[PDB]
Write a protein that binds this DNA or RNA. Structure first.
Ligand code: CL
Ligand code: CL
Ligand code: MN
Ligand code: MN
Ligand code: MN
Ligand code: MN
Ligand code: MN
Lengths: 98, 95, 87, 107, 107, 95, 82, 98
DNA sequence: ATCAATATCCACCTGCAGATACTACCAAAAGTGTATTTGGAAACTGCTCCATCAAAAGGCATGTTCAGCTGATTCAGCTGAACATGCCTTTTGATGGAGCAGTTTCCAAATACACTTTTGGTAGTATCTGCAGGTGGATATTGAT
DNA sequence: ATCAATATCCACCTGCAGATACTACCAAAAGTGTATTTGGAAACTGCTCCATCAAAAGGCATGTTCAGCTGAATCAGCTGAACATGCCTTTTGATGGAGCAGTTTCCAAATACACTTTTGGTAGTATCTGCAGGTGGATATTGAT
């Protein structure tokens, strides 16, 4: 009953996802989240389907980029594990919460 | 010798309404001028984009209002919007 | 008539595996258990900000439908220019 | 006979000048009559808000003349003004007193 | 003998179109005759630069059709295009393969 | 059904010049269209500002040129400036 | 006693900048690192300033040339015009 | 013979320099450096007095801000001493390079 | 704990750099009265957004198990911080001219007009053909022993 | 260093989606010359203000000493990775309905335009005075003992 060691499959996944371009969040749940948030600003809105897809492409690219910065913050602290404090430092230095 | 316009007369007048016994240095006044010109440009630029996106040739107070909502943080925007609307009302209700 | 079903708690549709996948694309090897909730909060802030601006353009235009272009202009305003959806 | 548009709108800021700056800045082909009024009032409002807080900072430092330092203290201690002006440098402003906790001595 | 301004200037990109976009954009009162010529040429040059590199990435991946991924690989592997487009997201572009060295196994 | 223009035609011509046997997906073409629109606005914007800063009412090829030098990095600026200068010189002399 | 102009940005002056930034303790390698960063900053801003100078057909860099440079570099400065 | 401990004067200077707004690089050497760099772009240039001063205000405000972010990166790695790698992380996450 | 050395605070002074106040003249705002432009009001499209639902794969949730990472401990050796001086660089102030910027001039060049020609974007169709995704099947890669 | 389990790779094969490619066009653009106005390059000066430059004056380059920081080596507890198992949702593909973007025509309002009347705002300068430090002395902080 064989087993890959901790880290091996994580590396395999890094290679797989850095090679591909498909969106990583499921479509319908993301769509519901957009509609919920927008509905809290303004009732009775409709969305072009491409508007939702534009939002998803932007959200994902933003989060991927943030994780890259976060990873660099963890490594700077001599860790390999990302923590909330890494995300917070990344955001602070980016001026999203300076 | 040519005329170099600025907002400093008006900044000074607003200073006296708000703090009648308070003055302002020349450097501080230059910062206030920079401030007015910066926000002017931000608001006017957003308004211009708004008109262009809606294929309109005209910037009205409605483009200025929406620009203010896009550019100012919450509470600033609310009061700016109410000050803007008040001035336009006063200006219309004035033979 | 019918009236839309109540939308609530849809931030949880951003699941732990979807967040791990995004982290993997970002080069991340190991992920603390607290990351998932922190990421949902960051995502919500980002989406709220961009949707707020998009809806502002929708309303300014006197439409009830948020277009791709409303989103593209909102993202541009936000210093997140996106190519591939018009403009 | 001739009344200023500022005095009509109840403003210190120059409605006429703002109108002209809108015309000659190539923002649009046309400019509605309300637009300079609204814009002038917004700019005045924001100016009043900063001078109010800067005046208070001058008062706190036993001073009657507003300097750049007082503008910086006003702006950076106010969450909303700090955000509006997050990518701006106030010459001769300096910074807020702020020492990270871990740098403080113990005993 | 109606000659296009593009043909006169030696360009594939549309000079007339660019002239009109400059006029309708409220950039200035007047637009010089050289302006849209110079601008269409620059835009043409940059699009050739991108398509050359993206076509290479397509060929490298044993493909005949350029897709957004090839555009992303071209832009992000070129120092200058990467800087020009540093605040732009290419939809369906993905990222460059890149694993920080400390994360690889062993010693 | 009203006409929605794009740079597609011209992007495709340039593609065939550089890579005769290479095609392009519509999504890729959407990207190229965004790119051209984006660079147009950036250059036109810098040119507008530059003209205003010098109290000129005309955007000439000299404003486009300086805008290009302000916006593009090193080598791309050099080569863009050559191709722009050469298109104008040719255009002028080709009348 | 000739010395590089960059070195005229001295250890004590860099130390003062750091202090205003809230820094308590400084590695010896910071001084040269900081000089490199300062030089890149000055290069980028001066290049744009001089590009505006040249465009206005001038031989004098104005405060406005610097102000416009700083603005397009995302370093907007208040107090020197514009 | 009297002696303040390591860190006591450093804290004092932080307090002193955070209270004040005077420029902290000497004027003449800054002016020289500005002229030198400018000479590579165009020869025989003059500068308004206010041009050099704008440059020095901008440059010092930038460096002070960068030292704040640098300090946060040192602290993130459980240090109190700023190092080149801290400046380098801060610059990377700011998007000023890499 | 003491005791002292040095930093820090506060009240008071006062000359002057740098404010506020005053004045006249003129650019540019506002008043008047045509002359263009525009952006909803109404009145219709067709599109596309919404919702619905059925089938089924595919990814999600959960529990178990343990590898190896984080963070605590301790510590030695290294490195920056503190500190006392005289030389060197900076700063301060005043001289000559480089060039800014003010001003008028006039013509090459731009706008506006209103015609003619051409294109590019379409809807309609056909029509091909690059490649997504699936199958073997050969070949690394990993981890245990 | 061997071998076994399993992920990887690669090259073929289909049947479309999506791309290319015609029409066959035709509405909107673009562009062809006239009539027309005018922006700004050019050439001249004068007066700021900038580079220089030499005297006055106050930071910094320096070497030594040791406080306490960093980074190393070790270890334990616990997190978070991996994977097996069960099954809930999202994905996919339609149906039908209608909400609403997107056009087109009147034009009554709303701007722009050309002219003229006036005045607010600038820029010279004339005064006025907030406060930058300078003093004196009292107290708090720091660090040794
Ligand atoms: Cl209006
Ligand atoms: Cl031209
Ligand atoms: Mn080729
Ligand atoms: Mn006391
Ligand atoms: Mn189970
Ligand atoms: Mn409608
Ligand atoms: Mn005092």
């Amino acid at each position: 009953p064989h087993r890959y060691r901790p880290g091996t499959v994580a590396l395999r996944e890094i290679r797989r996802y850095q090679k591909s371009t498909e969106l990583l969040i499921r479509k319908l749940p993301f769509q519901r989240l957009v509609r919920e948030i927008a509905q809290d600003f303004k009732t009775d809105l409709r969305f072009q389907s491409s508007a939702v897809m534009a939002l998803q492409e932007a959200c994902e690219a933003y989060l991927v980029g943030l994780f890259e910065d976060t990873n660099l913050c963890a490594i700077h602290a001599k860790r390999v594990t990302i923590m909330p404090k890494d995300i917070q430092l990344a955001r602070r230095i980016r001026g999203e919460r300076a | 010798r040519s005329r170099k316009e600025s907002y400093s007369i008006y900044v000074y007048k607003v200073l006296k309404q708000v703090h009648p016994d308070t003055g302002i240095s020349s450097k501080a006044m230059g910062i206030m001028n920079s401030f007015v010109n910066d926000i002017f440009e931000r608001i006017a630029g957003e308004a211009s984009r708004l008109a262009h996106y809606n294929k309109r040739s005209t910037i009205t107070s409605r483009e200025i209002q929406t620009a203010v909502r896009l550019l100012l943080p919450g509470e600033l925007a609310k009061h700016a919007v109410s000050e803007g609307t008040k001035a336009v009302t006063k200006y219309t209700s004035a033979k | 008539k019918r009236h839309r079903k109540v939308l609530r708690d849809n931030i949880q549709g951003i699941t732990k595996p979807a967040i791990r996948r995004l982290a993997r694309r970002g080069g991340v090897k190991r992920i603390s258990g607290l990351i998932y909730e922190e990421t949902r909060g960051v995502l919500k802030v980002f989406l709220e900000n961009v949707i707020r601006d998009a809806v502002t353009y929708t309303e300014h235009a006197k439409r009830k439908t948020v277009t791709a272009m409303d989103v593209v202009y909102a993202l541009k305003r936000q210093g997140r220019t996106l190519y591939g959806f018009g403009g | 006979k001739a009344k200023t548009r500022s005095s009509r709108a109840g403003l210190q800021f120059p409605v006429g000048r703002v109108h002209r700056l809108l015309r000659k800045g190539n923002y649009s082909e046309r400019v509605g009559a309300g637009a300079p009024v609204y814009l002038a009032a917004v700019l005045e409002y924001l100016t009043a808000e900063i001078l109010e807080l800067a005046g208070n900072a001058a008062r706190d430092n036993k001073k009657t003349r507003i300097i750049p330092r007082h503008l910086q203290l006003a702006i950076r201690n106010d969450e909303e003004l700090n955000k509006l002006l997050g990518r701006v440098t106030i010459a001769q402003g300096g910074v807020l007193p702020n020492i990270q906790a871990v740098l403080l001595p113990k005993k």
